A paper describes a structure:
Fast synaptic transmission throughout the central and peripheral nervous system is mediated by pentameric ligand-gated ion channels (pLGICs), also referred to as Cys-loop receptors. The binding of a neurotransmitter initiates a cascade of protein motions that lead to transitions between resting, open, and desensitized conformations. Here, we show in electrophysiological recordings that desensitization in GLIC, a prokaryotic pH-gated pLGIC, is enhanced in the presence of DHA. GLIC has previously been crystallized in its resting (closed) and putative open states, however, the desensitized state of the channel has been structurally elusive.
To better understand the mechanism of DHA action and to attempt trapping GLIC in a desensitized conformation, co-crystals of GLIC were grown in the presence of 50 μM of DHA under acidic conditions, similar to those previously reported for GLIC wt. (A) A side-view of the GLIC-pH4-DHA structure at pH 4.0 solved to 3.25 Å resolution with a bound DHA molecule shown in stick representation. Well-defined electron density was found for DHA in all the subunits in a pocket at the channel periphery; lined by M4, the M2-M3 linker, and the β6-β7 loop. The DHA molecule appears bent with a twisted/curled orientation, and makes a salt-bridge interaction with an arginine sidechain (Arg118) in the β6-β7 loop. However, it must be noted that the density for the DHA tail is not resolved beyond C13, and therefore was not built in the model. The R118A mutant showed robust pH-induced currents in oocytes, however in comparison to GLIC wt, the current decay was much less affected by 50 μM DHA. In this new M2 conformation, the pore is funnel-shaped with the hydrophobic extracellular-end (Ala13′ to Thr20′) wide-open to a pore radius greater than 5 Å, reminiscent of the GLIC-pH4 structure, while the polar intracellular-half (between Ile9′ and Thr2′) is constricted to 2.5 Å, resembling the GLIC-pH7 closed structure. In contrast, in the GLIC-pH4-DHA structure, while the extracellular end remains open, the intracellular-half of M2 (lined by Ile9′, Ser 6′, and Thr2′) undergoes constriction, with the largest effect seen at Ile9′ (pore radii ~2.5 Å). In contrast, the GLIC-pH4-DHA structure shows a distinctly different hydration profile at the intracellular half of the pore, with loss of densities for water and ions. We therefore suggest that the GLIC-pH4-DHA structure represents a desensitized conformation (perhaps a lipid-induced, deeper state), where ion permeation is occluded in the intracellular-end of M2 below the 9′ position.
Author numbering:
A (entry chain E), B (entry chain A), C (entry chain B), D (entry chain D), E (entry chain C): 5 to 315
Write the structure that this text describes.
């Protein structure tokens, strides 16, 4: 075959809809996710039209390579989609109803600034290249767009699956291409991170601060440096969950700022000990007593400085 | 082709059965598992019926694309099934017997609340979309549903493979779809976890508690902080076996509660030492002697508080 | 096509043979292994028989989908086999010679009780489903079963590749199925494990025992707890080589028993120190001197208790 | 089919262009990256030419296996490309316009000398083998070469995608082959590495240096050796991001040089302690006080020695 | 089709050549590597021969399934090769020129005795099975065997790609098979390993030896045991780069021998301390002073004992 000829000089509207049956494998590091969904297309090809009265049953089915079907292709995917054709129904008036079920690996970027309290807007871009004999445009059949009540993306809640109704079209290598935008919004399930990363990472920090109620370098070094080792256990665990962002993550800031509250603690401790060899135990254990508040304070300030700075 | 015409105005019962030949790769983190099984279908298409007497042999075989075969598709899979067709036998009266062997990667969620003492109900959902010319319904051929005596899902015992006989059917994008539910129940083999995770994780905790029979900060810090390091070895090992649940796991609770019995131990130790610089060795080593029971008690209580809270 | 009609009322013998060209990727954790082998089949279909004298060359070749070929399928595989057809030769008398080379991922379980001193019996099960018009049986063409002198399964020696000549056949969903059993026996190359896991894991234990010739808690805690950290390095390395068995592995026992000889060492040390604060340096360093033999003894006993218990 | 016959004795120019739709998965260790792009070809086959006036619409479409299409193949790929054919338009004068969209895994080496401040020149080599009946040459259709404003290669900025216009051609196994060179230049997003690797790796080093303001071996050993442990945490993390280069990386130098500033620190410390048993506390704590500047100096020198040496 | 009939009673020589376009992914652990190469075949089938003077152009091209092409198959591969056919040219005299480009994952074992200073001989074995009607033999077209100036196998230098000209042929399941042997020799790029594994692993050892210039058990235990921890960091990193060999690696020996120079160091230290409690500070610090040379000596001896033993 080859396309429907234009009765006027109009371009052909093709009526698209994506209905999600599964979302799975949101891979943060990779900035991807797998989807499994119906893709539903719908266009007018009068060449196929017919008389219901004489022909018998209302609507006519075709095997795929019988009729002309538009080159609808996903933009932002790695795996060029794996699809079964489900039904092709042609209505009396030459209007076609195409349905495939597909699954593909989509490549939408994620913004980690607010990790692990972030939300995202995933993107499934649909395209169609316009042929020789006529232009083609896509548009949204808002009733053939949805998702399942099953659909669970482990570690995220799912807000909306909507579609930007207006396809911005444009010239790509001499011909026109029409591009739609489907939008899956999600919010990270942050609960996990409290008792798995934050509360522990804090306890091991707080332990470090017990060297303010001690005056034994021999022991304080152990206190602070050992807990720094323990903290390092949890920096290398968090920084490889995520990709190398060229912008600062919020968790990453918190974590990096902690590397001072160890560094500076060592300084205080190293000083308190210094002065006590230099015999000013008054001035030494002024500092050390100060710290007992300075540290918890400057922390609760500076986490609130950051909190605001990031939200 | 195209479907059997409805003699009355009835829908079309299709007679389904899944017989498991292999279950494997239950992936906890992914919330998936691979299955390899016969799918057996069975429907009435009178167009194919015949006279055995004037025939040859009793029953007639067809190559797949010869006859009309219903669009039976798995719902909750990532890999749209890999299938070889095994036999299509048509009985004299137009009743078809379809058999394929398939294997697919199924995506059923697991509830980790009781890990690693949990059990699960896996789900293989079968669907069929209803065509223009008539509706289609599924139902269970209870004699064509089973599993092998071979079948072993490493790290789980397998209870039942049954099927919810009544398919709840419903409207999806204008047409009807009929959905069955096959149910594989399993229970985790928890033995591994005793001598691999729990008993060790306890010994390293108990060691921490030897700092109640000591009065040497210089050493006690080492005792408690080192064992905390060792414990951290086993938190990062358990917390990446599993997915990030937004609900509290039972193992996760135990583990998180342990991070206090290190934190609080440090407090006690830090205090006992504090008081000894402030000269109340009586009051100091009252506490220290108390702890010798307080800790083991509050633990056996609070593990039994949790145990109950989770079971 | 459809099968050879039975001249008597006999079932059809199909003459099977597997010749291994490669075994590779024995995956302990997965309980699998990849094989790459000739599958050779051989049956009598008189419909194909012919006159050599008049027809020309002695034996006739056919492209696969020309003749009737039996549905031979592997039972215990994940990847339903990838096969090239190599030759189909039909002898004058209607006897067919089928040869494919295949490769597949086989799923045979392994028994780890004796790891890493274990041996295994891998299993490649061949099946054939019996048709409508006649029954089918498999049997072994003992001269078409072997393996290469190349074949190396890294980390295992390979004993035998034999086949249980008698196929136990049986009824599966109304029809007969005939199942053969091919058996690849292997023994683990345990040498690696001596200087990589056992000898080191022992040295770090023996170091722990230097705290019996010391009377400095400050230091002994360090000695024992540090070496316990080092030992933990090698428990988490061994326990993820293997799958979670619900039965006790021999290596796992040894390892778990070691977690006492650290625990109990801490006890002794914690005691020796205790008594020295309570002023019985005699009784304290009686124990400590006892231990110097108690420990190495109770170890050589209890590894020999286990050794016998497991062999 | 078979090629266009040469009107003169000229070779055939084929007009190539690659338009990148996605770059992703730059795998440093593997020295690869996945691309997804239009490949656009364009040649003159007069056999296909026609009269527009009589034939109807201006330009003629063909299904792929209808016409002769040149054997264009990618050189430096692992996955021999996955391609859909998009359009084949033949202009009146026998000039063909071929368009496929492809995606492939490209194998271009990366130079890590300046990691993680490096830039790279990726390479997509296009080839065509020349046939019996005539020679074939490639050349660049500079207007059909570009990339998207979407295209993001996580962790890199993308400079240019250009093409070396002149294909160097040559004899390979008796016949000619013509090879083009497309060039994707990129620069690593180094920001991530400051607060994730460098600043921490420095703090843990600076802590080591607090043992110059201390005179307690018992503690200094702890200070220096513990921080060396912490540093080892970050050497094994960096050295497995990257491949085993046979040339010195810049990060690797820095890191390896740090292993001296621990080694030499131990020496100083071990000495200061030695002398203090030998009773020259003057000479001992001359050294120690010297070091307080020697170390930070020799570091700022030697990082600047290297910095220059590498840039 | 079916083969060329033998004019005499000779077997058919088939003229093979492999030209490497890419080698990549030498996987030490797996004992594999991916190759991407031309396979070029060449045989005499007179049935295809012709008269150039009357037929027109010198040489005739055929689509693959037109002519008889020999069953050439790779022996030692996991992935049964992925191939495009490039050209089939038939010369006037019935001699065929076949060319495919293929890529496959080859399974050649590597000998790790001398790791990481080893070299290897990779193996790509070509086979052909001999038919009913006549025998087939392979042989090398030495001018159609080579490699690219591009070809880079990251972490190895590439010496030669040659072919054992004489195919040893043999009987496999009743018929003859002819097997060629192509040989890719490579040498490991060992530079990486000096500043990444050996020099550090030595510094951490040398630090251990600073406990000979100290007489503080409290501290020496820390010195030696901590550095043993640090060394363990680098044993578990080296021992999982490589497969479990049943023979001793050279790196593995060095590493295992190091586990004594920690063990024995502990002994010395544990002794020096013992004697100081038993009051022979002379005899104690005789040993300690001896060691200061004993250790570095016995090391430079015993690494040279081994060096020789392995080379
Ligand atoms: C020392 C620790 C040894 C623990 C062995 C528990 C026995 C068990 O595993 O008990 C099983 C129940 C699960 O309940 P179920 O629905 O009956 O299924 C299982 C039916 N079986 C048993 C017949 C197969 O889990 C529990 O209550 C777990 C108790 C918490 C123990 C955690 C220790 C914390 C420190
Ligand atoms: C230091 C790197 C910082 C990167 C942040 C980027 C832009 C400035 C901050 C903008 C506010 C962004 C927002 O909160 O939405
Ligand atoms: C902390 C979040 C906990 C969520 C679990 C929900 C309810 C508490 C437990 C109820 C019993 C549920 C059950 O185990 O059957
Ligand atoms: C604890 C779980 C024990 C599992 C194995 C059962 C019994 C111990 C050994 C029995 C003898 C088996 C054998 O050696 O063949
Ligand atoms: C010591 C091993 C050094 C290997 C690198 C090779 C040459 C030295 C550096 C040359 C400058 C390279 C450049 O910056 O262009
Ligand atoms: C311990 C296992 C050692 C095995 C090496 C085998 C034989 C002894 C060495 C012979 C020389 C082999 C060589 O190094 O080229
Ligand atoms: Cl697509
Ligand atoms: Cl499906
Ligand atoms: Cl290609």
């Amino acid at each position: 075959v080859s396309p429907p000829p234009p009765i006027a000089d109009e371009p052909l509207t093709v009526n698209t809809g994506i209905y999600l049956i599964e979302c799975y494998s949101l891979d943060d590091k990779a900035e991807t996710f797998k989807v499994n969904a119906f893709l539903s297309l719908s266009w007018k090809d009068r060449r196929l039209a017919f008389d219901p009265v004489r022909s018998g049953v209302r609507v006519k089915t075709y095997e795929p390579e019988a009729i002309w079907i538009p080159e609808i292709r996903f933009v932002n995917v790695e795996n060029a989609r794996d699809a079964d054709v489900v039904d092709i129904s042609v209505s009396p008036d030459g209007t076609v109803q195409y349905l495939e079920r597909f699954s593909a690996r989509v490549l939408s970027p994620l913004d980690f600034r607010r990790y692990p309290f972030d939300s995202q807007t995933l993107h499934i871009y649909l395209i169609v290249r316009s042929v020789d004999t006529r232009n083609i445009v896509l548009a949204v059949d808002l009733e053939k767009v949805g998702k399942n009540d099953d659909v669970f993306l482990t570690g995220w809640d799912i807000e909306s699956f909507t579609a930007v109704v207006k396809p911005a079209n444009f010239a790509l290598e001499d011909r026109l291409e029409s591009k739609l935008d489907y939008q899956l919004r999600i919010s990270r399930q942050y609960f996990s991170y409290i008792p798995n990363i934050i509360l522990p990472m804090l306890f091991i920090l707080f332990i470090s601060w017990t060297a303010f109620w001690s005056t034994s370098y021999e022991a304080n070094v152990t206190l602070v440096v050992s807990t720094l080792i323990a903290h390092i256990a949890f920096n290398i665990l968090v920084e490889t969950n995520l990709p190398k962002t060229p912008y600062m993550t919020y968790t990453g800031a918190i974590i990096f700022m902690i590397y001072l509250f160890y560094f500076v603690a060592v300084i205080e401790v190293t000083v308190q000990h210094y002065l006590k060899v230099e015999s000013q135990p008054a001035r030494a254990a002024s500092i050390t007593r100060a710290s007992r508040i300075a540290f918890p304070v400057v922390f609760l300030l500076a986490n609130i400085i950051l909190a605001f700075l990031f939200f």
